[PDB]
Amino acid sequence: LGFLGAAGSTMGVASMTLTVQARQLLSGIVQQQNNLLRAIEAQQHLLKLTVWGIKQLQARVLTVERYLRDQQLLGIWGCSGKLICTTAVPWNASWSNKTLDMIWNNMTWMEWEREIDNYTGLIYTLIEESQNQQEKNEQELLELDKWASL
Amino acid sequence: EKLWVTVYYGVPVWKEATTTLFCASDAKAYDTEVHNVWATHACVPTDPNPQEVVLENVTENFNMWKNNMVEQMHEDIISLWDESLKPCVKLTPLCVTLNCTDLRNVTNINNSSEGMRGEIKNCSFNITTSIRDKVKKDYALFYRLDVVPIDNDNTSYRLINCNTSTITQACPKVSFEPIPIHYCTPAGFAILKCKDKKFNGTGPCKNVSTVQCTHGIRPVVSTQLLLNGSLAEEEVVIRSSNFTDNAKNIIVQLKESVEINCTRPNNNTRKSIHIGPGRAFYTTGDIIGDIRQAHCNISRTKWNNTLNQIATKLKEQFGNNKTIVFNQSSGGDPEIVMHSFNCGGEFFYCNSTQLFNSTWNFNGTWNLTQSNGTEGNDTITLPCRIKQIINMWQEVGKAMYAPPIRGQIRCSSNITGLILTRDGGNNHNNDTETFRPGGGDMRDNWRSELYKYKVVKIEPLGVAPTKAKRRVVQ
Amino acid sequence: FLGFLGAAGSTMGVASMTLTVQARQLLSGIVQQQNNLLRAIEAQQHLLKLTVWGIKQLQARVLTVERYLRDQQLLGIWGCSGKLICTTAVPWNASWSNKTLDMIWNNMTWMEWEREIDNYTGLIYTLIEESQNQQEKNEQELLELDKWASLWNWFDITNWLWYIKIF
Amino acid sequence: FLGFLGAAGSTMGVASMTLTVQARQLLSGIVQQQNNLLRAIEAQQHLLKLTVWGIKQLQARVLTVERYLRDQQLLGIWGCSGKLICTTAVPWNASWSNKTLDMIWNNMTWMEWEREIDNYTGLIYTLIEESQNQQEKNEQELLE
Amino acid sequence: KLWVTVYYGVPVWKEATTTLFCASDAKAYDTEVHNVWATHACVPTDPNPQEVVLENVTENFNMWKNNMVEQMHEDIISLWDESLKPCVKLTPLCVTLNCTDLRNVTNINNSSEGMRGEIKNCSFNITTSIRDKVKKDYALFYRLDVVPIDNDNTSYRLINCNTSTITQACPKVSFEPIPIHYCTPAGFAILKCKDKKFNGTGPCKNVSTVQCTHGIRPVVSTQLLLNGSLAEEEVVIRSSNFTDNAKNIIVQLKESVEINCTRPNNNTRKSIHIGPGRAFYTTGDIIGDIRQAHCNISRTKWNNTLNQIATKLKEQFGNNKTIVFNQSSGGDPEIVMHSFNCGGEFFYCNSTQLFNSTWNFNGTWNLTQSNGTEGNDTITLPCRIKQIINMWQEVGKAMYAPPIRGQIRCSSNITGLILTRDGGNNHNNDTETFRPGGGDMRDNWRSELYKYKVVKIEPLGVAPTKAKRRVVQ
Amino acid sequence: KLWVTVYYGVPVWKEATTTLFCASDAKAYDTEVHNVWATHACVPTDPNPQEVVLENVTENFNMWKNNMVEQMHEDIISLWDESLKPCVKLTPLCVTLNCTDLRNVTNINNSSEGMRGEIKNCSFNITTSIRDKVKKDYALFYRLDVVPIDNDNTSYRLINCNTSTITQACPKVSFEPIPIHYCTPAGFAILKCKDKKFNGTGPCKNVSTVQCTHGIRPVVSTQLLLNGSLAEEEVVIRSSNFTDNAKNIIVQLKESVEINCTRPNNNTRKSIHIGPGRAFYTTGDIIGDIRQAHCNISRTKWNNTLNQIATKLKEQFGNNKTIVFNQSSGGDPEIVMHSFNCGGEFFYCNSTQLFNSTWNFNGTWNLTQSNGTEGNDTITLPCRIKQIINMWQEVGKAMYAPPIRGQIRCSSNITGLILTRDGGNNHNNDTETFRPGGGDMRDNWRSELYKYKVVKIEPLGVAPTKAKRRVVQREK
Numbered sequence A: 001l002g003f004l005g006a007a008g009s010t011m012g013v014a015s016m017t018l019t020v021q022a023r024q025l026l027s028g029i030v031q032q033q034n035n036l037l038r039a040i041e042a043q044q045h046l047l048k049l050t051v052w053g054i055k056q057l058q059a060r061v062l063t064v065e066r067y068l069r070d071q072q073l074l075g076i077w078g079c080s081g082k083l084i085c086t087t088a089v090p091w092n093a094s095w096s097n098k099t100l101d102m103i104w105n106n107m108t109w110m111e112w113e114r115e116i117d118n119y120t121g122l123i124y125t126l127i128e129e130s131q132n133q134q135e136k137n138e139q140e141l142l143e144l145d146k147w148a149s150l
Numbered sequence B: 001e002k003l004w005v006t007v008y009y010g011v012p013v014w015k016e017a018t019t020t021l022f023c024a025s026d027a028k029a030y031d032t033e034v035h036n037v038w039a040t041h042a043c044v045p046t047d048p049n050p051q052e053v054v055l056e057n058v059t060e061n062f063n064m065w066k067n068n069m070v071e072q073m074h075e076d077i078i079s080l081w082d083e084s085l086k087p088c089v090k091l092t093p094l095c096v097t098l099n100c101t102d103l104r105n106v107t108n109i110n111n112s113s114e115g116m117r118g119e120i121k122n123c124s125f126n127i128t129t130s131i132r133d134k135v136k137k138d139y140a141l142f143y144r145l146d147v148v149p150i151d152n153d154n155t156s157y158r159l160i161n162c163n164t165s166t167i168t169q170a171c172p173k174v175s176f177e178p179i180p181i182h183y184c185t186p187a188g189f190a191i192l193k194c195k196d197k198k199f200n201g202t203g204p205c206k207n208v209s210t211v212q213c214t215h216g217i218r219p220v221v222s223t224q225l226l227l228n229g230s231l232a233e234e235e236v237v238i239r240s241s242n243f244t245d246n247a248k249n250i251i252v253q254l255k256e257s258v259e260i261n262c263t264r265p266n267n268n269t270r271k272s273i274h275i276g277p278g279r280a281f282y283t284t285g286d287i288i289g290d291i292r293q294a295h296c297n298i299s300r301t302k303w304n305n306t307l308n309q310i311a312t313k314l315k316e317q318f319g320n321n322k323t324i325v326f327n328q329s330s331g332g333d334p335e336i337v338m339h340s341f342n343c344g345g346e347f348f349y350c351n352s353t354q355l356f357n358s359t360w361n362f363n364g365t366w367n368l369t370q371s372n373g374t375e376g377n378d379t380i381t382l383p384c385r386i387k388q389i390i391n392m393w394q395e396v397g398k399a400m401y402a403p404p405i406r407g408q409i410r411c412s413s414n415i416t417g418l419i420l421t422r423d424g425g426n427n428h429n430n431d432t433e434t435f436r437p438g439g440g441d442m443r444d445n446w447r448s449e450l451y452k453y454k455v456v457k458i459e460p461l462g463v464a465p466t467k468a469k470r471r472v473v474q
Numbered sequence C: 001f002l003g004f005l006g007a008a009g010s011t012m013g014v015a016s017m018t019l020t021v022q023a024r025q026l027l028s029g030i031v032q033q034q035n036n037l038l039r040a041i042e043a044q045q046h047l048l049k050l051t052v053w054g055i056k057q058l059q060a061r062v063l064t065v066e067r068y069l070r071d072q073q074l075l076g077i078w079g080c081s082g083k084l085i086c087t088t089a090v091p092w093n094a095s096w097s098n099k100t101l102d103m104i105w106n107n108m109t110w111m112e113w114e115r116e117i118d119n120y121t122g123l124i125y126t127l128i129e130e131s132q133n134q135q136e137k138n139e140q141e142l143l144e145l146d147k148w149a150s151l152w153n154w155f156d157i158t159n160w161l162w163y164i165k166i167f
Numbered sequence D: 001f002l003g004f005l006g007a008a009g010s011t012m013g014v015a016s017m018t019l020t021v022q023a024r025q026l027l028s029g030i031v032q033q034q035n036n037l038l039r040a041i042e043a044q045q046h047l048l049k050l051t052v053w054g055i056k057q058l059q060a061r062v063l064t065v066e067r068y069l070r071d072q073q074l075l076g077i078w079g080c081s082g083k084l085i086c087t088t089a090v091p092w093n094a095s096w097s098n099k100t101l102d103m104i105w106n107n108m109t110w111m112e113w114e115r116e117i118d119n120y121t122g123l124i125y126t127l128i129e130e131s132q133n134q135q136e137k138n139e140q141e142l143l144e
Numbered sequence E: 001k002l003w004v005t006v007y008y009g010v011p012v013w014k015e016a017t018t019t020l021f022c023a024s025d026a027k028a029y030d031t032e033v034h035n036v037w038a039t040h041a042c043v044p045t046d047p048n049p050q051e052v053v054l055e056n057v058t059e060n061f062n063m064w065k066n067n068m069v070e071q072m073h074e075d076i077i078s079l080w081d082e083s084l085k086p087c088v089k090l091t092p093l094c095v096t097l098n099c100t101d102l103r104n105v106t107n108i109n110n111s112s113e114g115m116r117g118e119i120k121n122c123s124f125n126i127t128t129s130i131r132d133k134v135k136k137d138y139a140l141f142y143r144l145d146v147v148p149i150d151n152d153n154t155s156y157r158l159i160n161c162n163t164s165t166i167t168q169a170c171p172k173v174s175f176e177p178i179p180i181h182y183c184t185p186a187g188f189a190i191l192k193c194k195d196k197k198f199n200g201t202g203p204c205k206n207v208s209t210v211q212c213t214h215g216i217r218p219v220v221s222t223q224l225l226l227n228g229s230l231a232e233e234e235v236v237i238r239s240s241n242f243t244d245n246a247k248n249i250i251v252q253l254k255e256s257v258e259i260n261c262t263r264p265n266n267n268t269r270k271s272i273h274i275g276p277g278r279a280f281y282t283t284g285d286i287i288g289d290i291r292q293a294h295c296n297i298s299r300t301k302w303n304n305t306l307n308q309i310a311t312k313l314k315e316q317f318g319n320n321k322t323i324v325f326n327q328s329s330g331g332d333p334e335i336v337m338h339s340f341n342c343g344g345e346f347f348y349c350n351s352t353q354l355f356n357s358t359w360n361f362n363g364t365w366n367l368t369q370s371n372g373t374e375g376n377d378t379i380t381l382p383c384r385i386k387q388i389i390n391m392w393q394e395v396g397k398a399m400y401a402p403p404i405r406g407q408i409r410c411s412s413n414i415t416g417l418i419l420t421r422d423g424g425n426n427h428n429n430d431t432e433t434f435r436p437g438g439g440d441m442r443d444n445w446r447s448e449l450y451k452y453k454v455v456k457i458e459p460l461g462v463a464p465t466k467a468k469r470r471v472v473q
Numbered sequence F: 001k002l003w004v005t006v007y008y009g010v011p012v013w014k015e016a017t018t019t020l021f022c023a024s025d026a027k028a029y030d031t032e033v034h035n036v037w038a039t040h041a042c043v044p045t046d047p048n049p050q051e052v053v054l055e056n057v058t059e060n061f062n063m064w065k066n067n068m069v070e071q072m073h074e075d076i077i078s079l080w081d082e083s084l085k086p087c088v089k090l091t092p093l094c095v096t097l098n099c100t101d102l103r104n105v106t107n108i109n110n111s112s113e114g115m116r117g118e119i120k121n122c123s124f125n126i127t128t129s130i131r132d133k134v135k136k137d138y139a140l141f142y143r144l145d146v147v148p149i150d151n152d153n154t155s156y157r158l159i160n161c162n163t164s165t166i167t168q169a170c171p172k173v174s175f176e177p178i179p180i181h182y183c184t185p186a187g188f189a190i191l192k193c194k195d196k197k198f199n200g201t202g203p204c205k206n207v208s209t210v211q212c213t214h215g216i217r218p219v220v221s222t223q224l225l226l227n228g229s230l231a232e233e234e235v236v237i238r239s240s241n242f243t244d245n246a247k248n249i250i251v252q253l254k255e256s257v258e259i260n261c262t263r264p265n266n267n268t269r270k271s272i273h274i275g276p277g278r279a280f281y282t283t284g285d286i287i288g289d290i291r292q293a294h295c296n297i298s299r300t301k302w303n304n305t306l307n308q309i310a311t312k313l314k315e316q317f318g319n320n321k322t323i324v325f326n327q328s329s330g331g332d333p334e335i336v337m338h339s340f341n342c343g344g345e346f347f348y349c350n351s352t353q354l355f356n357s358t359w360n361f362n363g364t365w366n367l368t369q370s371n372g373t374e375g376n377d378t379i380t381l382p383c384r385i386k387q388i389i390n391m392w393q394e395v396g397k398a399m400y401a402p403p404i405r406g407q408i409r410c411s412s413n414i415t416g417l418i419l420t421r422d423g424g425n426n427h428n429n430d431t432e433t434f435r436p437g438g439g440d441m442r443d444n445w446r447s448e449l450y451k452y453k454v455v456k457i458e459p460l461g462v463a464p465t466k467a468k469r470r471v472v473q474r475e476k
């Protein structure tokens, strides 16, 4: 499988259904596809840099980077725990000037990002990452003096 | 009324992107261990069940002329071909004056000017093999197309492109048999399939699905007619970048398969002369039996109707009140002037005039016609001349010699598409539209199968405002 | 890798002593160490260039990476990317095995165990992540707001009280 | 505010609040972030048939991928995989430098402090490795 | 009591050696013409490079001990290797070359004015693709491309023949140096000494970082640095050991000196086919009078330029010094005569005038202007063409350059000088002599890479803190 | 109830096929001028390798189904391809060779010497870089590398010139085997069967595991095994199917038999430039008189060793059968004559003396000691020299060895033998006829990887436990 689909479904429908199940399946296929190729890599062992060989090699690297760079952001954003993570950054009117329903009932996830695109380059790139440092550094400052037991 | 960003991993959002696709062919070829195909040898296996999803409520824009896949596929098959003939003997030493005496069969009074007079020439030559101190006189039953008169002498001919290019003989063991190749996107990438029953090749495609792997796109390279390809659905579809422009080729996709029975009805014996240390040049020894002309059988009625269909679609595309002329290719490369393809490892330059000659008239009897007698329909036989020396389509410096396939050759290809070219030619008082069989540009052949595919990347990271807040600080 | 699995696979129990917790981290640690050694080499010789061996090491490096990635990815799917040994909420359908815990551990060795589960493997793994997701979404909505509780959490419960004195 | 290495001359404390800036560009690379090229090439096309540069770009990528992975593996061995700033139970042996926190975080910059702790790096890392082992023991008996 | 606190993302860097990749501008690929540097392979240059300034930071650079120099050295020579790898080998071409003094039998065009002997119209019987066919063919070789043989007045041969192969350069591949931007892989960085006058070694007052080098044109030139970067309001002189002799002296100029160079001869191309699919390109004939190649140089501009360098050299070797300029003593034409490439054509120019200048220590200060233009008294440099070019270091592996159709024109900017202080054994009380140098691709790379150094970034960091795990589950 | 618990790091492996990277000690890496089997690429081995003994572990090791032997073979073949790829080729030399003046004189040179004109001052009208000018040169060529042409008593050529391209090996490249440690990548492991003796297949009592294989020299030899490994306690015989006659019989000696081999001649190393930057390396003159190459075998030690394997051979086909060590049946010289490479020069040594003895167990004997240590203890092997090595797998791709200057001396360690049983009446005649064999490199690598089996380590595991994920068991 490995196909989220439901792209046409309203972002809210996608933010309510297939908001974790299909996404779990998507990642569950990424490792399978990999496992499958690995199973053959052992059988064929024709990893020789041929015309297709180099293609397979480039493809392998491309996928590795794709997964990591995504996980990297999540980890910095303190969202490595799971697919859906709530943050403490409030949404600036500049970013979007709509209502929760306007974005969930009258917007598709693709269309939604299309508008935020410009603002998104800062929403998570700077504000979200900065939020983590405050929390991280605070956690340390909090653990510096701690007594509360149960 | 307070919204806080909530990062969602797995959002169904994607972006148009170009990438390095990987081949995925049926493992049966690997098990057969033939590894003679110019590709598929290291190509990975194909997911037994193709994995596709119907993206309903999605109207992605599709453009054939802007499909990177086509450009990639082109370089791939080119590189695959170059790699296959990379470690094979070259005919650079065979570049000598060839005493092309008419073949004894050609002289034979039995075939009194019946046909094929000089088509197969018995050319003799002096060669220098591994022994650089001793020369050797050898004979090779070459073809007429491969040789070119040099001294205007009776039997003075030479291998075509002897100096213009480096003739490299493809290793005889290798097999030129296109087997379903499935181009697959690395993860995080997807191929979008224009599922529309009829698509203009450019513009928004409504009915739309996707695949992680292309369908078995056989890398069959054929000029004019498109054999063994994807059939059009219900309606013949004509696709062009600028229909108004004449320079651009016109890709016609047939809805029905015009099965073509091509054969080489000559029992042949392969001869091999050692030329260079451990390097053997393979040629023909003797033609066993009367020399007969290679031909292809096409049902006139079945094709006549085929043309009737393409003519109507062409009339709708242009002026329905216009005379349509299916003239023959007005000169050009031998590949373009005559339908060309490789059946059973031999390239058959077959005449396609009979197929593209009849000119339809508007305001006439378009009543589809049907056969009334077996002899009446018979078959459209094509005078075919086998050219072994094949130069690169878009490169002149590189030419590839073809090893003779000994024995009878025969194929059953299916005509699935046709390349055409509009040529207004200052039609007297317009009212006339001429069309000639187009060809060349390997990309044209690949476009007929990637017409629906569109590679896009995937971004499973999306931030959205949510009344919920991390609220982890407190 | 020096102490790579220093202790061999004994009864899953004896193997699951302090040995598993230590040997596993030690293996992961020394695996990281020898990998770091190879990079110290490449950072110096800088000769690895499409040679019979150069292609070998390059492909090997890629393999190790995707091999590690596949394992971690799985841990992620079923929300176990943190602790090496993570419990699940998936019950053992008797179909998977009738053996008692003692048979499973104080006798079965990880090597022969996976054999009698080879048919179940791909099934079980799918149940692990499936259950993880089922509760995950519910949990996401379960604690979605609860801002009221958070107030009492530092109003009454005083998550971070500053009243730290004696007597 | 500060650039990629903007807190290079800043004291350990000030730089501590800018850690993410560097962490964000550890894997993010020009060649990598390019994705689809405006060139006819597609993700380095076919490495241009292993060009002199084709292989270097290829090699460069693996090093970014393996290096980030090594880094992660380490924090993972130390447990705090996802976390950025962790808190070990390893007591700070004064042998590794006897300095007050004020000097360390309000005077010494990370670049300068690292030189002092350079010799005592592997020792410390293993001490964390075995501390997590002790932690795991405590957790196992707690679950029991 | 404190506890180790793992800090991920610490701003700490350490000197490292790693592979680098080129990022040429998109416009370079947009040319749609293959460049010997294969700029097409280079990744698209990021529109705006990010020059983060490292404030409160000082770093020790080693222009002479920078891996990147050695790396780029290998990269450039490998680039050329693969560029001419699949080109005609001109192997069979070498035979016996019977030659004439000029392509003009008499003063057909300008035999009197034309440099008699340079053309050396050599004719030869070469075999085409057809093995049984031999053809007499003629070609033009500058004296620098033919060696007299058999003592016969008319019998000659290719210069680097007998010795090594002389593969012709693939004609389509052009040789226009396109600025490349060596970029560090993620987790690595390049540090740029923003300090104005840097000796190439030692600490840096101002230091910045770039993930990508500034565009560097891979121009190879001798006794000069063409189209190079410019110093900052002060000519700078760098050498690992100034008190040594063999050490070549690098000089980066603060002011660019324009050098107009051209081949004033209209040429035609003749594709002599030598072997199947192998065509040797050669000059058919010069259309019009023959004029030797030259270069124009503003006496006054070069004057002031040397003046600035001379002073810097007295500052380097004791105030009181009569810095005297002299021409290369002897050796390979490469390092004896100033040579460079111009529009796909190598030029060996006799910069005799540029170094025919012995200066004392008094009255030399006055910076004379150009009151009397006199056509700028432009210095005209006698320039010739050596078609075959030997590998700078490798004895074997020579290469031929196919002729370009038509008059070639060039206008590079002088941006640097390579010098060799000769030991003051005697007669050198104050006559400090600096003969032109060169002969080493590395010396050119050091001049442009002095301000850069590559450091691995280690994001892992430890620190003591009163905080404790406090993890009791 | 029983909730499955995921355990990471479970000790589980699975027979797998993985790309292996060579790891050399990098001791001679500093000597870059020295080039041997791409040592420069081989990454320096771990300074302190550790072999974790697998206690209470038993594993099967099918040597004839090992993947390592296959990988070594492919890599070693490609290594030679890479070495000869940028080197010169003798396509022009394949000219009619007027071979005469076999020896300056047949006096002291051939008075009793068995040279009998093995070398020849062959002359030939070959061209050079000048192309136009053609010059005739003379070069001493071994009768082994030369083949007579026509009925002419002086027209000759190179054994493989007409049917195979000869590529001149680059002289700067050394040909001395180095300890190459085939190391497996992380996530994979090499099991090591430590049983004192092994049938070469079936379960293994003592089993261990190592991250890299022990140092294995890429030695290619025939009818013998040089600088190899030794068996444990006693000799071990190994075959896919011993009772089958075709299957080659692999033998591993428990004791090392020193073989002193040397070319006792001072050779001038002449060089002939043929083409631009293409110099053919040959021999100008043999300084002094010409002496044939020879190898020294301890007559007593070899008897004892042959008796040892003979006993094992009885233990394999019944004491009733007599052991008959006969000479090589016939075929290509590579196999007919024990042929190895000493000091970058390939030597062909007659092995009839080492394979000419009917042990006949019914004959009673114990061990043979050497009372006469001085003399009569050197089975001198008549060794001939060859420079044109035919490829072992393909007719083409022949290779020329540029002559070495001075005396070429070596002292390898015999460590086993490759044999061939001959099914026939001889066996019915109460006799096992074993003849030496070779020509299949796979056997050489099998003799060193015999105790190795690459397996992939899958840290992933599942296990029912009475513990549930309490992350779902949250509260207010």
Ligand SMILES: *[C@@H]1O[C@H](CO)[C@@H](O[C@@H]2O[C@H](CO)[C@@H](O[C@@H]3O[C@H](CO[C@H]4O[C@H](CO[C@H]5O[C@H](CO)[C@@H](O)[C@H](O)[C@@H]5O)[C@@H](O)[C@H](O)[C@@H]4O)[C@@H](O)[C@H](O[C@H]4O[C@H](CO)[C@@H](O)[C@H](O)[C@@H]4O[C@H]4O[C@H](CO)[C@@H](O)[C@H](O)[C@@H]4O)[C@@H]3O)[C@H](O)[C@H]2NC(C)=O)[C@H](O)[C@H]1NC(C)=O
Pocket (backbone or CB within 6 Å): B300, B301, B304, B305, B358, B359, B360, B361, B362, B363, B364, B365, B366, B367, B369, B370
């Ligand atoms: C491959 O496909 C082709 C295409 O279908 C098949 O061949 C087709 O066969 C058709 C007949 O079955 C034939 O149609 C006849 O065309 C003749 C000439 O066509 C032109 O002219 C007519 C009339 O226009 C006239 O008037 C205008 C002004 O209004 C003038 O400007 C013109 O100059 C003319 O003077 C047009 O209609 C056409 O479109 C063309 O412009 C006609 O003569 C013919 O009419 C009848 O007479 C024929 C004898 O003269 C007779 O053979 C034909 O059958 C017609 O018979 C009529 O009467 C009978 C009895 O009442 C009735 O049953 C018929 O139905 C009909 O009414 C036709 O119009 C196509 O021209 C022809 N096309 C080609 C390209 O050859 C071919 O068979 C097929 N092959 C296979 C193997 O399948």
Ligand SMILES: *[C@@H]1O[C@H](CO)[C@@H](O[C@@H]2O[C@H](CO)[C@@H](O)[C@H](O)[C@H]2NC(C)=O)[C@H](O)[C@H]1NC(C)=O
Pocket (backbone or CB within 6 Å): A097, A098
């Ligand atoms: C979101 O913000 C935009 C920008 O202010 C609003 O669009 C403006 O609407 C007003 C009032 O009619 C106009 O005068 C402007 O010309 C609009 N500006 C732009 C940029 O479009 C929009 O109405 C807001 N949406 C809501 C419902 O809050």
Ligand SMILES: *[C@@H]1O[C@H](CO)[C@@H](O[C@@H]2O[C@H](CO)[C@@H](O)[C@H](O)[C@H]2NC(C)=O)[C@H](O)[C@H]1NC(C)=O
Pocket (backbone or CB within 6 Å): B152, B153, B154, B155
């Ligand atoms: C090649 O053969 C043809 C046919 O025999 C020659 O053409 C003939 O030439 C003779 C003498 O000029 C004429 O009398 C005949 O009438 C010609 N016949 C034809 C059919 O043209 C030709 O001359 C020969 N030589 C060449 C040019 O190859």
Ligand SMILES: *[C@@H]1O[C@H](CO)[C@@H](O)[C@H](O)[C@H]1NC(C)=O
Pocket (backbone or CB within 6 Å): F318, F319, F320, F321
């Ligand atoms: C060998 O054959 C003989 C036949 O006489 C038999 O007696 C003996 O047992 C067989 N095996 C041994 C152990 O020699």
